[PDB]
Structure formats: structure tokens, C-alpha cells
Amino acid sequence: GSQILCVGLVVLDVISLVDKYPKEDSEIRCLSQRWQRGGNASNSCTVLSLLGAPCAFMGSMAPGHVADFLVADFRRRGVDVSQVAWQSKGDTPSSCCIINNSNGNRTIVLHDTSLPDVSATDFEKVDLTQFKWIHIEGRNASEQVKMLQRIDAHNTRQPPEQKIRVSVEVEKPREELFQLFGYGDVVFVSKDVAKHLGFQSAEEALRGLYGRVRKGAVLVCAWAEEGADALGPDGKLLHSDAFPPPRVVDTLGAGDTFNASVIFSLSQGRSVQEALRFGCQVAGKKCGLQGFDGIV
Amino acid sequence: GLVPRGSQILCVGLVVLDVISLVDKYPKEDSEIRCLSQRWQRGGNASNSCTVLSLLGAPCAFMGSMAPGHVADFLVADFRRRGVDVSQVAWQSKGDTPSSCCIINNSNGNRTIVLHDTSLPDVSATDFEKVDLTQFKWIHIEGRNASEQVKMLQRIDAHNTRQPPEQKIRVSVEVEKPREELFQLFGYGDVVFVSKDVAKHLGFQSAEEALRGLYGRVRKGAVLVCAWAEEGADALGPDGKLLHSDAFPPPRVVDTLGAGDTFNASVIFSLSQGRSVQEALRFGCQVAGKKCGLQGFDGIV
Numbered sequence A: 001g002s003q004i005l006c007v008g009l010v011v012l013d014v015i016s017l018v019d020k021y022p023k024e025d026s027e028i029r030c031l032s033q034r035w036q037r038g039g040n041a042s043n044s045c046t047v048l049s050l051l052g053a054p055c056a057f058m059g060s061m062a063p064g065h066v067a068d069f070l071v072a073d074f075r076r077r078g079v080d081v082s083q084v085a086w087q088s089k090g091d092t093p094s095s096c097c098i099i100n101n102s103n104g105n106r107t108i109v110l111h112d113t114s115l116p117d118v119s120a121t122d123f124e125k126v127d128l129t130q131f132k133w134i135h136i137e138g139r140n141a142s143e144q145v146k147m148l149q150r151i152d153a154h155n156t157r158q159p160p161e162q163k164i165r166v167s168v169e170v171e172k173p174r175e176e177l178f179q180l181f182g183y184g185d186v187v188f189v190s191k192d193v194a195k196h197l198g199f200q201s202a203e204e205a206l207r208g209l210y211g212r213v214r215k216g217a218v219l220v221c222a223w224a225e226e227g228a229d230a231l232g233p234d235g236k237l238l239h240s241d242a243f244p245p246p247r248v249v250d251t252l253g254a255g256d257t258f259n260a261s262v263i264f265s266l267s268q269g270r271s272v273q274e275a276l277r278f279g280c281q282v283a284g285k286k287c288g289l290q291g292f293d294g295i296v
Numbered sequence B: 001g002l003v004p005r006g007s008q009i010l011c012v013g014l015v016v017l018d019v020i021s022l023v024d025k026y027p028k029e030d031s032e033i034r035c036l037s038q039r040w041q042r043g044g045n046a047s048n049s050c051t052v053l054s055l056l057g058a059p060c061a062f063m064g065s066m067a068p069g070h071v072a073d074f075l076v077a078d079f080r081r082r083g084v085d086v087s088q089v090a091w092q093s094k095g096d097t098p099s100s101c102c103i104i105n106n107s108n109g110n111r112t113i114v115l116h117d118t119s120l121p122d123v124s125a126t127d128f129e130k131v132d133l134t135q136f137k138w139i140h141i142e143g144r145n146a147s148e149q150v151k152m153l154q155r156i157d158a159h160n161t162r163q164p165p166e167q168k169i170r171v172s173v174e175v176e177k178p179r180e181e182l183f184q185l186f187g188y189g190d191v192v193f194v195s196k197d198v199a200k201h202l203g204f205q206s207a208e209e210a211l212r213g214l215y216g217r218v219r220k221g222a223v224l225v226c227a228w229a230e231e232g233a234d235a236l237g238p239d240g241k242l243l244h245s246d247a248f249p250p251p252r253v254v255d256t257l258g259a260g261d262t263f264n265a266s267v268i269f270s271l272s273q274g275r276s277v278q279e280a281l282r283f284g285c286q287v288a289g290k291k292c293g294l295q296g297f298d299g300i301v
């Protein structure tokens, strides 16, 4: 296997750049506008391609002009779109993103079209042999657990040399998703999910949630500008300071940059410490740039 | 393709992609919230007046700036969907096709707007100088870049001086934004539309006060028109006789977005058809009122 598969969402980000965030009932005029392809699994694909990794995307899309824009962007990047689960019923999701130029803060108003999510049936149809690593963005937990069990089954039949590495992301504080803790060799838990569970630091979260992971898995938690932490089976907490840019201009997709960079580094055989550090390095570079161009 | 001579109604002005999201509570900065419902709409005054003229049964054309891209493709497809001739569009090499983002809170009804950037150049007088006016029976200009538009208005004046009265192009002008640059446009056109917002900003408290106060600013024999929402509309012509029409409010008000544009297009339509200013004021008020009980422009006729 050579490719890195990212299973999750693709969203059209209808971005506006403002000098100051608007006050409810106001009329600000934006600096600039752009269409950017978004969604967590989608943004991680952009980053992996830029990092020089052969990657593929798996997500639901509806035939139409929004899909044509997204597909052309995926293709322009060299993202393998051959795994896309095309839906006959529904529309492709989009969102209004407000990026504050004075601090880089991103405010998203998402429109979730109720496009059916990728099923365990869609996933059974995939020939796993081309993949080196499979990353799943937590969405439809019950259906994704069946996908994770399929990869587990594949791997039991494989020599250690050709075992598919698996990562999982729990970004939304949804009780259903917490069963995914659970599966995978690398588990990414968000600051928002951690705070929701009552943890006030990435060290508190990793010590509190490590009991929920599979034997020998690595639990990772990025805490924005405070840097990121990781905890493996050795019980040794690992840390990396952030690499903040002198001027933070766009934080939209920073966490996705972190996830893809950590996945990349580990796929390349680097240590968890090296990977934590690289993840923050790339996430920080991206924060001082508009979009993903120039992160390398 | 072939458009018969003196058949179309031209609307010069703005087209924009409005992205309207309905939220239960306004988002706090850095949040990743999910909206109730999200609509993409083709907005802009000259743009909305085109939709209405097509629905009224009028062959119409739009003239405005657009840049090649995916926003333009959405807008062009909508123009076409409402059967608007888009052959006059001034395509720009530099700039963004306008897009505005509206956030409507469902718990209080308050609208938060993030207005399009200023990057796209407006239609120039040299752009207009390239249009063959013979296919138009009427030309309506939305006040934007006043200095340039005055040269466009003078071009139509020049065209008309060498035309017989039956082949004269009728001209209307809209002053909707309260900016001093635009107030020079009162001096052009056969029909001048002044807004309630512009009127109030000049210190007028009624459409009667505005028409009596601003009539001196119009050219000889022009008609000054002012719609005052639910209070109805007024018109004042060279005879010095103030004309009025009550509003025709719908049983329930659904959507007032583009009501003024519906009024303008309906008044232009009626006059283009040879009806009296009184008949046209009334028609403008009827159509604008029908639209208010409707979501969008779909069933206004």
C-alpha cells in the first residue's frame, strides 16, 4: 500500500475576510471573498498532497455544479476522487465562513444538506490493498465502527510489514462518537470535545481518556496556541509548543493541517514526538497564510 | 441572436450572489454552528427589476459588471432561468463578482449583512458607448457611479435628438443610496425614482414633502416618483399635480426583499405600455404588494 485514505466530509467554504467581526444587526463590508474546498477529511487531503503524499478522499457528493467545483479542486491537487460515494438524493453541503484578519479567527455557519453519510456498505466495496493508512473523521459512529472492524479483519490476515495503519478523529462533542476511542492506532481528540468532558488542559484530557483507547494506541490532543500533547502505551506524556506566526491571518483548517501533518510524519516512520512537533510546525505556518497554498 | 428594433427594456446596475442563512441564535466569533436553512439568491436592484420585467411579459436585458468564474456562472444561470438577455454584461479581467452574506436570526428576526468587496469596477461610459441602443425602447439606470452614468445618459440624449418621437428611447433613473455623488442624477431621465431612505436622509418626513422639495432638481417635463412602503406611492409631473396610490398590503407579509425593485419595474412596465402615471403608480403598488405575501418573485403574476 502507498496511498493515505481520508474518510469524511467535503464542504464548499464561501469565505469572507473582515478586519473586525460584525456586531449583530450591523452591515460590515468585507476585504475579500473566496471559494475554498472544505470539510475535515477534505482539508487533510489538501495538506497530504502538498506534503508529497499520494492520497485519496472518500465522502458523499451529489452530482451538480458545486460538486464540479470541488472535484476540479480535488483533481488540481492530485487527490484521488475515485472512492467518492455519489448520492442520487440530496445536495452538496456549503457554509458561510467569516475570517477575521485582525486575529485569524474563523466563524462557520454550516448548511448540512442531510446528504446521506458514507455507509459501511459503500466502504465494503473499497479494495484496501492500495492504502498504507486510513483516517476516519467521526460522523456516523455506528456505521464507521463496521468500517473499522473491516480494516481490523484485513490486518489479522496481513504480515506486520503490510498492516494498514488507522487514525480516528473525535471533533464534535457527540456521545455516539465516543465509542470510536475505541478503534485506531492514533486517536485525535479535540480541545472542544475535551472541555465538554470537563478537562481544562490537553494533559488532563490525555490522562482522563487514555483508558478508552485500544491496547497500544496513541491518544493525541492539540490545544490551539498552547501546543499539542500525545500519550502512548508507555505512559509517557509528550508535548510540543505551537509555532505561532508573527501575524495569525487564517485559522480555518489549522486542526486539519495538524492531523494530516501528524499522520504524514508517522506514516514516514518518525517518532510520536517528532510528529507532534511537525504537526504544530505546519498548523502554525498555515495560520499566517490565507488557505493552504504556501504551507510548504 | 436577433432582437427586434426598439423591443427591449435595459436595466443597468448591480448583480450580486446573496447567501442567506437562518440561525436560531447569532454565532459568537470562532464558533462552528449549523444553520436552520440556507438560500443562494441573485440580488441587486437592476438585477431584481429584470426578473420582474420578464415575469410581467417584457423582453428585457441586464447591463452590469461580472468577472468570469463560478459566482458569475450561478448568476448567469439564474438570469437565464428568469429569461433575461445577458449579452450586454461588462466582463471584467480584474475583481470579484459581488457576493453578500446575510445572517437572519430566527429568535429576533434581526439581519446581519457582510457586504461584498469593492474590487469589481462598475460599468464605464466607454463600456456603454459600445452598445447599439436601437433594440431598446426604455433604459433604466440604478445610481452607482454618478460621474460615468451622466455620460451614459448624455449619450441616450444625443441618440434621441436625431430620432422621430415614435423612436425615442424612454429613460428612468433610481437614486436609492443617500450619497451626494448620486444627487446629480436627478437632472436626467423622463422618470426619476427617489427612495424613502434618500428622502428621509434629506430631511423629508413624507413622499409629498420629498416630491415637492426635490421636483426643482429634475429636467423639464420629467416625473419624480417616491414609494413610501405601506404608506403607498406618489408621483409628481410637470403639471404640478401630486398623484397618489395606496399600498395593496398582502393578507400576511412573507418577504419584502425586492418590493421596491418590483415597484420600479412595474411602474416602468406600465408607462412603457402607454398607461398614465396614475395607472402606473397603482400598478406598481399592486405588484409590489402581491410580492410582499410571497417568498421571492415566483407568483407575482
Ligand SMILES: C[C@H]1[C@H](O)CN1c1nc(N2C[C@@H](O)[C@@H](O)C2)cc(C(F)(F)F)c1C#N
Binding pocket: A105, A106, A222, A223, A224, A225, A226, A227, A228, A242, A243, A244, A245, A248, A251, A254, A255, A258, A279, A280, A281, A283, A284, A285, A287, B030
Ligand atoms: C493545531 C494546533 C496545535 O496545537 C498547534 N496548532 C495551532 N492551532 C491554532 N488554532 C486556532 C484555531 O481556531 C484552533 O483553535 C486551533 C492556532 C495556532 C497558532 F497559535 F499558531 F495560531 C496553532 C499553532 N501552531
Ligand SMILES: C[C@H]1[C@H](O)CN1c1nc(N2C[C@@H](O)[C@@H](O)C2)cc(C(F)(F)F)c1C#N
Binding pocket: B227, B228, B229, B230, B231, B232, B233, B247, B248, B249, B250, B253, B256, B257, B259, B260, B263, B284, B285, B286, B288, B289, B290, B292
Ligand atoms: C414599494 C412600496 C409601494 O409603496 C408599495 N410598496 C410596499 N412596500 C413595502 N415595504 C416594506 C419594506 O420595508 C420594503 O422595503 C417596502 C411593504 C408593502 C406592504 F404593505 F404591502 F407590505 C408595500 C405594498 N403594497
